[PDB]
Design a protein around this ligand. Structure first.
Ligand SMILES: Nc1ncnc2c1ncn2[C@@H]1O[C@H](COP(=O)(O)OP(=O)(O)OP(=O)(O)O)[C@@H](O)[C@H]1O
Ligand SMILES: [Mg+2]
Lengths: 906, 238, 385, 101, 54, 241, 53
């Protein structure tokens, strides 16, 4: 440390720690006197650089501060940075750390502020040279140690981030602001940013985003593509490159509003397409929900290869996975055109092959019955629906149904729903139609109507490849003029095809849903079906649906139930879009009535989705407003008010739900809790409002996919035994279902306690009974999620009928609706060319470790479990493939996706 | 338990002094024996304590008792030293009586004999040394390998390992070795020994020592160079 | 950095918005029910006066009376009457009297002891599940007897019979046993009691078994619950005193365990873990099955296993600059996973002398030598040589 | 003085507890007091000659005080941000100590 | 250490918000059980309350 | 616990009594042999001293066991005394029987048995003596060994026993030279003895010295014990005094 | 003991869970007795002089 002169080279370094003699006196004097000596300075630049490098090891603040103190002055005081033009410019390399030594190493508040601005200007000017990049680089990849450089190099980087962000917030931009003093664009700092990005991608992960989001442009992202696609395999493996990429959309997912968010996700998709794995391509293409992106990956395997190969099989598998059926329709017909084989290809794309795999799983799971033995009165009706709820999905319980005794003892609306429940036994199955047919050609019209509902449910698993579509059966019934028959028919058609907007299906539903002049309560099903059809894909925001809603309001207001169902139907229709839904909010609000305001708050949720934080505060101010107004005083109307209040509560919950799925992923615990308290505001603000908020809570949880499932449903349940409306329990159980008999036991004991214990109305009893059977499927037969499973940020289309029903007081008519509850998840199995129905081994993982993921790319350690197990729900969701030690290679990466495994053994 | 003294038995029937005697064997250097069909190779780890240790005059871990029986040890080095000398007075004495050189079968009994004697008594501790005695008979040419243990129990093994992480070498040996065909070439059998010893040294080719007994009173100690070539064959293939 | 932010994005917004909600909502809870709830508040208020004289309940006779013994000293023959039930009153509870006439106006209190603090843990471990990595065959064993019959009771009725009671984790030191108890209890979210077996010996005579009554009295109320008795090896030859702890106590504390864990009491639905480094130290009747069922033996981690354990520790670290990481594992044979955590401790200590902030590959090799020298004594190769 | 910690000397004593009155279940208590007055240095002097019935116990009970203190300290490593409550152990020679201290 | 260091600092601000929520939430309590039957006992008990025989 | 008699082992296969006997050694002064191909120096340090302790009339930490093998002693001098007599008696027994002055190996091996023997048999105490054996035999030339109290031996190029064994060993191997000189070997022994020993000045009277050489006149073997004055002079040369 | 008899039933039953069979059969009883007898010697004291002979 102490000076020891020029005795050896070691002690020269110690000499310049206190006072440099080759950077301070000599150089200073030299610059301020002769200008022949500019030639001597140029040679001495190299020497000066070395002395910095050697003393980078030293860290103490005092011996960098004072040492380079008079050099820091010289910039403006003696040199003025223009006494020899080129020469001070290229001698800015040692002087730039001198400035940083007062910024970061010493903290003097007055100088730390002031010299931040100075650093920005000189960074820009010296990046013209391209030597400011090299200045950053020697500290980024390091040469020596000190505490100092590790904080210092960022100060240089931060200058760039500073300016670019500011040009958006303040419209003036450029060097007109004195907060940087550096121009925003221009070919002098643009080339600096590109070069900086290269070094920082290799060694860090840093400034590469700050630049993207601050530019605000997809262009920034498309530059990124170029550099990364080189890096894809030689610099580091495919996997490492990917973790950056799916992240590209996710970190700023919850902070790109609609036009930005879509434009960025286009680029991540394209990066994946360029790289080796098309498996990563399909996942992002589904995300966007655009028809165009789906087609491109499907085409990429199918069209170039003339031969059948792996390629045709792989295409079919990828499109099959979405059980929306949006991908299914699009991908079909290319298989027919190419014509290698029709028979295998068409079936494999359709959900027909998913029926066959279910049988293999079912064999393990067997059948255990537990259905209620009660008969007579409303208890007969309760038990017959309960049988269907326990045998959801493909199950065989033929003989019980064939005993027509209990079937015929149902009466009224009970008959319709009884026939519908029979259909859910053969849910996702071609056979079952026989049982329905018997009733349909005999007795009163009531059983005829219920048959059509059951056809709907059964047809879910078979409606593609032109193999018994729901359309075929149900067209005849629509033609028939009776209201009960036609209403039932179009409800079932919507369910079966789900998100598929095939020409025949869509175009049948196109002239209709435009009569609401005639007063029919059960014409809710008119719009309700069409809304269901629309979800799963981008929405035209159809003119048929918008027109009829307005017309209904003109015609009637007597049937309160009718207009409430209608309001929800618009909001569900617009799901699968948010860019276009900003427009239609204004369109609805053009015509203003207090009744119309109820519709608006629902549609606000969809428009603002995946962006809601302005939406959240809005849906809370709304809640406050009735009471607030009463406050003011404290110091026909019936129908309009009630619609107003109920809509808001539903809207609040809906906003939260869609938002929590797409967004980041930690926050999921928290969003459930926002409901408990919404209810709490409600717990001493509206008495009427409490009734609605109870029912909403359960579907809040199911939609949101909460991490905690043990404590919260059970605790809430106890309070709500006292409170009226037993439909609260039904909504809780749809969440609790999870992986069966983990979560769902506590629910069976708890719900069973209130139900068995208290009888004081057979009406109250009925709701409680149905909920209990729903929760469990025997021996983990299937699971239900609202989410796709293929994406855990996804949202289904079949589960939207579940979401609809919790907005209204319980009714016998509503019971018919509740039979439908479709939303199946398939159990993965390793496939072969002979279509092997067994998985070898898998790792299952409760909680991802990785802080390099949210979703969690499954750890390679896991806990090992056997063959042929259902894809586990929460506390099991990350799934890694064990097959590598028996040396099998997945073709289709599986992270806990719905998607069936496929392996190639060599 | 009943380690307060040697003569008192034990509810558990195990004399503790013998059990602890075994434990002491693990202190000392690893030694391994492997028989061929025409060879026995007796190798031992020769662990170097410091670089000031001579190779001029410092004892080898392997000691010839007589001119055709060879002996290695594992254990308390102090104790081994008198055990080897006692073995030897008898061994030579075997010729005084019979005018026949020392038979390997008579010799294992004797070494087990001095040891058994010390255990039986109460006013001596047992030897904390298990030994491997390798050799052939004078009369015949079939390879013979014996062991003595502290206890005073002796066995024959095809190949056997003792001292310093003995377990890990024992398992290694099972997998490599074949009892259907023991190696019938002296070189390949040596190579099996080297591979074993590699493990316990971790790194060394100047700390592996190999000795060989061959029939008709051939005993040789292998060059440090010669062992390094075998290590060279083993590192390349791996 | 940008990966960290995705996580940081959800976490901030969602909870801080709920905080802002709850704050406003304190008022709001009163507003929908203010004539059932304030009606109830009124009637509560009227009968009980002020103050509320706290007594401690000795016992009730079931007929609508009780005998209480206050701390203020007088005993009183009270009535169980009004806003109180016979099921809510159980010995050792602290009951609320109205002062001017002792009528039991409610119970709002059961615990306030310093004692129960001891048993409970306010825990936050820095290593949770899947930093137990490797030895996975035998973590699967602790799962089956602790984690998985809590998580699905389904499986243990599908097979029928009782789910196996308890476990003993036992073997060599360093084999990761501690981290197992703390990490399987992270998974379940069951009440983790923790007491050491050097804290089961007492410096007062015959209070030792009273303490052992406290552990499963606590366990049984907060159940489902995982009771860790850490180091129950210290029962056989480690004792605080001899004329005020003595020989009687050591045996009695073990007799006490027997009655808790499979005595009449039985105390079903407490999963018990016992870590002990030697099972030949332990009592023959406490290593009786059907109170601790199967035993899991651990051994000094094997050569492939120590790869796993090296990756857990050097994931924190700045990695090797030249890389020799795979050869570190090879040199070690018959060695603990605690040697691995003492090796990355030892690498960054050599680094700490320089007070440099990076770590390089060469520190690894040095650090392994340093810490192997510490292990081996000068009388081991004194006794031997 | 440099770190600014309360140097709290512990020794197993019966004088540091007016409530339980012994140093066996005052290992738990030590952590909570030192947590109020953090950062702190815990100087548990294992003298192993302090007692009169502790020394008769097992050669010294003070080793037992240290083994409980370690583990307790292990499960909360980030209860305020890192550690804070430093366990300074001290003994004459390490012969006198256990293989698990 | 700016890329991880800044972000680490925001994580500590989050925790403090959470702890504050437990305190905010705990502020209703209000846990007196006696139910619907004991609404009769409160009339009965006003007469026992001015009773000198208890 | 196991700190008793010699028959009994510890369950870790340790005889505590050999381990303690080692530790006896470092409570008596430092003793160093350094081997060189020009000769061996043996150098020793006094355990303690006073100003009227006579130590210029006799040695008592350097004994000749014969006319070609001599020993430095570190440890209890009482235990040493009996073992030196037994060694010396044997040294002449070998002389009588074979007409050769006893080989270095036969003499170390004998005494290793004897030390071992007092531990192994009976109730007798083990010995707590480290002898640095420095000899000549016409087989191996120059030879250094040292024997543990444990009753085993190892050959050396340098060794230190007695107090401060670890440090004294370290400084020796730091500056050791493979061929060395006899003269340098004497210098390296004073250099080490200074830093290890807690006496303020290193005095001739705290030193005993003997050298065994065949290079001080060949044909013959000359054992040269340094007298006080020779010791006193060589400190000067190395500039400690 | 009948505690060991409970360790054949429990031990045969966790092999039922892992195989993904719901029932128990005879073969899994065979492994279950062998695991409990053989494991019992290890916990208990045994330090024989018959580990080389
Ligand atoms: N398989 C493993 N995976 C991860 N870390 C491991 C593994 N095994 C050991 N460790 C590490 O070694 C550390 C030290 O071991 P730990 O404190 O758990 O002791 P133990 O074997 O129970 O000893 P005792 O209970 O006798 O004091 C662990 O905390 C953990 O960091
Ligand atoms: Mg432990």
């Amino acid at each position: 440390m102490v000076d020891e002169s020029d005795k050896k080279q070691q002690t020269i370094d110690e000499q310049s720690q206190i006072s440099p003699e080759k950077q301070t006196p000599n150089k200073k004097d030299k610059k301020k006197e002769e200008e022949e000596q500019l030639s001597e300075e140029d040679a001495k630049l190299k020497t000066d650089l070395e002395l910095l490098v050697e003393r980078l090891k030293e860290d103490d603040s005092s011996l960098y501060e004072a040492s380079l103190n008079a050099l820091k002055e010289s910039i403006k005081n003696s040199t003025s940075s223009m006494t020899a033009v080129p020469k001070p410019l290229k001698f800015l390399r040692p002087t730039y750390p001198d400035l940083c030594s007062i910024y970061d190493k010493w903290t003097d508040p007055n100088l730390k502020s002031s010299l931040a601005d100075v650093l920005s200007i000189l960074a820009m000017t010296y990046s013209e040279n391209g030597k400011h990049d090299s200045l950053r680089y020697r500290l980024l990849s390091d040469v020596s140690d000190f505490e100092g450089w590790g904080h210092e190099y960022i100060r240089h980087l931060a200058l760039e981030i500073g300016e670019v962000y500011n040009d958006q917030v303040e419209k003036d931009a450029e060097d007109e602001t004195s907060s940087d003093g550096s121009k925003s664009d221009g070919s002098a700092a643009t080339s600096g940013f590109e070069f900086s990005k290269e070094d920082t991608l290799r060694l860090c992960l840093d400034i590469v985003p700050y630049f993207l989001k601050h530019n605000g442009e997809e262009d920034a992202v498309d530059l990124l593509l170029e550099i990364e696609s080189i890096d894809k395999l030689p610099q580091f493996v495919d996997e490492n490159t990917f973790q950056r990429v799916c992240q590209y959309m996710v970190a700023c997912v919850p902070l790109l509003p609609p036009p930005e968010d879509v434009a960025f996700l286009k680029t991540a998709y394209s990066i994946y397409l360029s790289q080796n794995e098309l498996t990563d391509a399909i996942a992002l293409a589904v995300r966007l929900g655009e028809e165009d992106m789906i087609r491109s990956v499907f085409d990429a395997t199918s069209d170039p290869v003339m031969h059948k190969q792996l390629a045709y099989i792989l295409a079919a598998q990828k499109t099959s996975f979405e059980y929306e059926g949006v991908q299914d329709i699009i991908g079909n017909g290319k298989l027919s055109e190419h014509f290698l084989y029709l028979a295998k290809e068409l079936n494999l794309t359709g959900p027909k092959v998913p029926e066959d795999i279910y049988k293999s799983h079912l064999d393990n799971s067997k059948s255990v019955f537990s259905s209620a033995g009660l008969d007579s009165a409303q208890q007969n009706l309760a038990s017959s629906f309960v049988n269907g709820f326990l045998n959801l999905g493909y199950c065989n319980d033929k003989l019980i149904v064939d005993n027509d005794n209990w079937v015929y003892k149902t009466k009224g609306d009970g008959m319709t729903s009884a026939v519908a429940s029979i259909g859910s036994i053969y849910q996702w199955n071609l056979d079952g139609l026989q049982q329905l047919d018997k009733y349909l050609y005999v007795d009163e019209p009531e059983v005829k109507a219920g048959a059509l509902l059951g056809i709907g449910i059964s047809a879910s698993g078979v409606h593609d490849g032109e193999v018994e579509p729901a359309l075929l059966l149900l067209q005849d019934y629509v033609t028939n003029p009776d209201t009960k028959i036609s209403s039932a028919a179009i409800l079932g058609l919507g369910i079966a095809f789900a998100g598929s907007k095939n020409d025949e299906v869509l175009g049948l539903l196109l002239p209709i849903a435009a009569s609401t002049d005639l007063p029919i309560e059960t014409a809710a099903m008119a719009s309700l079906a069409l809304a269901h059809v629309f979800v799963g894909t981008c929405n035209g925001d159809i003119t048929t649906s918008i027109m009829d809603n307005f017309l209904e309001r003109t015609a009637i207001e007597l049937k309160t139930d009718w207009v409430r169902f209608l309001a929800l139907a618009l909001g569900i229709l617009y799901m699968g879009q948010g860019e276009q839904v900003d427009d239609v909010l204004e369109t609805i609000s053009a015509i203003e009535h207090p009744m119309t305001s109820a519709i608006e708050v629902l549609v606000g949720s969809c428009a603002y989705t995946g962006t809601g934080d302005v939406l959240l505060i809005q849906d809370l101010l709304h809640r406050l407003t009735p009471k607030n107004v009463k406050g003011e005083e404290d110091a026909e109307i019936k129908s309009e008010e009630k619609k107003g209040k109920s809509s808001d509560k539903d809207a609040t919950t809906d906003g939260k739900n869609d938002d929590e799925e797409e967004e980041k992923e930690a926050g999921i615990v928290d969003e459930l809790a926002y409901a408990v308290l919404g209810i709490a505001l409600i717990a001493l603000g509206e008495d009427i409002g409490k009734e609605m908020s109870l029912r909403h809570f359960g579907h809040l949880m199911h939609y949101g996919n909460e991490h905690i499932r043990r404590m919260v449903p059970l605790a809430m349940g106890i309070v709500s035994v006292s409170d009226p409306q037993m439909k609260v329990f039904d909504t809780l159980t749809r969440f609790s279902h999870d992986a069966d008999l983990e979560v769902s036991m506590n629910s069976i004991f708890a719900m069973g306690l209130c139900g068995a214990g208290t009888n004081n109305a057979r009406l109250a009893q009925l709701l409680r009974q149905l909920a209990s059977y729903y929760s469990r499927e025997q021996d983990a037969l299937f699971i239900t999620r609202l989410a796709q499973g293929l994406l855990h940020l996804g949202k289904g289309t079949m589960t939207m009928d579940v979401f609809n029903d919790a907005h209204v007081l319980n009714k016998v008519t509503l019971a018919s609706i509740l039979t439908t509850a479709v939303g199946l998840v398939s159990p993965s199995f390793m496939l072969k060319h002979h279509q092997l129905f067994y998985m070898l081994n898998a790792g299952i993982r409760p909680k991802f470790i990785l802080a390099l993921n949210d979703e969690g790319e499954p750890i390679k350690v896991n806990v090992r479990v056997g063959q042929a197990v259902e894809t586990v729900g929460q506390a099991g969701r990350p799934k890694k493939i064990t097959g590598w030690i028996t040396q099998s290679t997945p073709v289709l990466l599986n992270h806990g996706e719905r998607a069936e495994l496929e392996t190639d053994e060599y | 338990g009943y380690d307060r003294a040697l003569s008192i038995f034990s509810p558990d029937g195990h004399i503790f002094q013998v059990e602890y005697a075994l434990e002491a064997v693990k202190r000392g250097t690893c030694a391994v024996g492997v028989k061929g069909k025409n060879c026995v190779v007796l190798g031992c780890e020769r662990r170097s304590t410091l670089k000031l240790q001579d190779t001029r005059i410092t004892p080898s871990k392997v000691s010839k008792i007589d001119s055709h029986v060879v002996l290695s040890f594992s254990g308390l080095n102090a104790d081994s030293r008198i055990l080897i000398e006692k073995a030897r007075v008898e061994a030579q004495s075997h010729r005084l009586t019979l005018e026949d050189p020392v038979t390997v079968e008579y010799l294992t009994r004797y070494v087990a004999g001095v040891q058994q004697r010390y255990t039986q008594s109460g006013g001596v501790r047992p030897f904390g040394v298990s030994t491997l005695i390798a050799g052939f008979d004078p009369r015949d040419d079939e390879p013979k390998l014996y062991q003595t243990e502290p206890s005073g129990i002796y066995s024959s093994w095809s190949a056997q390992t003792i001292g310093r992480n003995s377990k890990t070498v024992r398992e290694f040996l099972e997998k490599n070795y074949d009892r259907k065909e023991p190696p019938a070439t002296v070189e390949e059998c040596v190579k099996l020994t080297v591979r074993s010893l590699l493990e316990v040294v971790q790194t060394g080719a100047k700390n592996i020592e190999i000795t060989v007994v061959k029939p008709d009173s051939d005993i040789v100690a292998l060059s440090s160079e010669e062992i390094n070539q075998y290590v060279t064959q083993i590192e390349q293939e791996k | 950095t940008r990966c960290k932010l995705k996580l940081l994005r959800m976490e901030r917004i969602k909870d801080h918005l709920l905080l802002e909600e709850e704050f406003v909502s304190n008022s709001e809870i009163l507003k929908p029910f203010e004539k059932k709830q304030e009606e109830e508040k009124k009637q509560l208020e009227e009968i009980r006066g002020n103050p509320l004289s706290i007594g401690t309940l000795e016992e009730i006779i079931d007929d609508d009376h009780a005998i209480v013994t206050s701390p203020t000293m007088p005993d009183y023959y009270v009535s169980i009457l009004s806003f109180v039930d016979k099921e809510l009153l159980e010995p050792g509870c602290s009951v609320l009297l109205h002062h001017k006439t002792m009528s039991i106006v409610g119970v709002l209190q059961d615990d306030a002891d310093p004692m129960v603090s001891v048993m409970k843990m306010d825990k936050s471990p820095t290593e949770s599940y899947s930093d137990i990595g490797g030895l996975e065959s035998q973590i699967q064993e602790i799962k089956e007897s602790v984690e998985l019959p809590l998580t699905h009771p389904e499986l243990y009725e599908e097979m029928g019979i009782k789910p196996p009671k308890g476990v003993i984790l036992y073997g060599a030191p360093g084999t990761g046993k501690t981290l197992l108890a703390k990490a399987v209890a992270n998974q379940t979210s069951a009440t983790f009691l923790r007491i050491v077996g050097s804290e089961l010996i007492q410096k007062y005579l015959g209070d030792g078994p009273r303490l052992c009554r406290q552990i499963f009295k606590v366990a049984g109320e907060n159940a489902p619950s995982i009771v860790f008795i850490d180091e129950i090896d210290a029962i056989g030859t480690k004792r605080y005193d001899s004329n005020s702890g003595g020989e009687r106590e050591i045996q009695r504390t073990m007799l006490e365990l027997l009655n808790q864990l499979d005595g009449f009491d039985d105390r079903g639905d407490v999963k018990v873990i016992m870590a002990t480094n030697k099972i030949e130290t332990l009592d023959p009747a406490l290593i009786r099955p059907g109170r601790i069922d199967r035993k899991i033996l651990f051994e000094n981690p094997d050569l492939s296993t120590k790869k796993k354990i090296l990756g857990i520790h050097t994931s924190k670290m700045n990695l090797s600059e030249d890389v020799n990481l795979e050869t570190l594992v090879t040199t070690k044979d018959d060695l603990s996973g605690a040697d691995i955590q003492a090796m990355c401790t030892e690498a960054g200590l050599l680094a700490l002398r320089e007070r440099r902030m990076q770590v390089t590959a060469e520190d690894f090799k040095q650090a392994k030598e340093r810490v192997m020298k510490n292990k081996v004594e000068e009388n081991l190769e004194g006794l031997y040589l | 003085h440099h770190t600014d910690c309360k140097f709290i000397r512990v020794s197993g004593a019966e004088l540091v507890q007016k409530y339980i009155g012994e140093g066996s279940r005052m290992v738990r208590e030590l952590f909570v007091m030192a947590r109020e007055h953090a950062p702190s240095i815990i100087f548990m002097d294992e003298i192993d000659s302090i007692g009169s019935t502790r020394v008769e116990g097992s050669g010294g009970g003070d080793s037992e005080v240290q083994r409980t203190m370690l583990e307790l300290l292990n499960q909360l490593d980030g209860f305020e941000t890192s550690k804070n409550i430093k366990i300074i152990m001290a003994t004459n020679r390490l012969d006198i100590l256990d293989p698990a201290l | 250490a700016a890329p991880y260091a800044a972000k680490l600092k925001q994580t500590e601000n989050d925790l403090k918000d959470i702890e504050a929520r437990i305190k905010e939430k705990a502020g209703v309590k209000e846990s007196d059980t006696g139910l619907a039957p004991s609404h009769l006992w409160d009339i009965m008990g006003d007469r026992q309350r001015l009773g000198e025989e208890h | 616990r196991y700190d008793s008699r010699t028959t009994i082992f510890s369950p870790e296969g340790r005889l505590y009594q050999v381990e303690y006997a080692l530790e006896s050694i470092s409570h008596a002064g430092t003793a160093i042999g350094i081997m060189a191909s020009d000769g061996i120096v043996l150098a020793a340090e006094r355990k303690v001293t006073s100003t009227l302790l006579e130590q210029d009339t006799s040695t008592e930490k350097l004994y000749k066991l014969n006319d070609k093998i001599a020993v430095a002693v570190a440890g209890l001098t009482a235990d040493a005394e009996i073992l030196i007599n037994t060694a010396r008696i044997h040294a002449q027994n070998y002389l009588k029987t074979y007409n050769e002055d006893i080989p270095v190996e036969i003499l170390v091996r004998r005494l290793s048995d004897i030390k071992q023997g007092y531990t192994q048999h009976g109730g007798l105490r083990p010995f707590g003596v480290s002898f640095i054996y420095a000899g000549y035999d016409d087989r191996y030339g120059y030879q250094l060994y040292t024997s543990n109290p444990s009753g085993n031996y190892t050959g050396w190029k340098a060794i230190s026993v007695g107090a401060n064994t670890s440090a004294a060993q370290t400084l020796l191997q730091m500056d050791y030279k493979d061929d060395m000189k006899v003269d340098d070997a004497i210098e390296l022994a004073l250099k080490t003895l200074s830093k290890t020993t807690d006496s303020s000045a290193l005095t001739y009277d705290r030193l005993e010295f003997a050298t065994i050489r065949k290079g001080a006149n060949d044909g013959e073997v000359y054992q040269k014990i340094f007298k006080p004055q020779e010791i006193k002079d060589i400190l000067v040369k190395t500039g400690i005094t | 003991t009948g505690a060991e008899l409970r360790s054949v039933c429990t031990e045969a039953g966790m092999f039922a869970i892992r195989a993904r069979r719901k029932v128990a059969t005879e073969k899994d009883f065979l492994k279950a007795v062998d695991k409990v007898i053989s494991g019992y010697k290890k916990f208990s004291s045994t330090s024989r002089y018959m580990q080389y002979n």
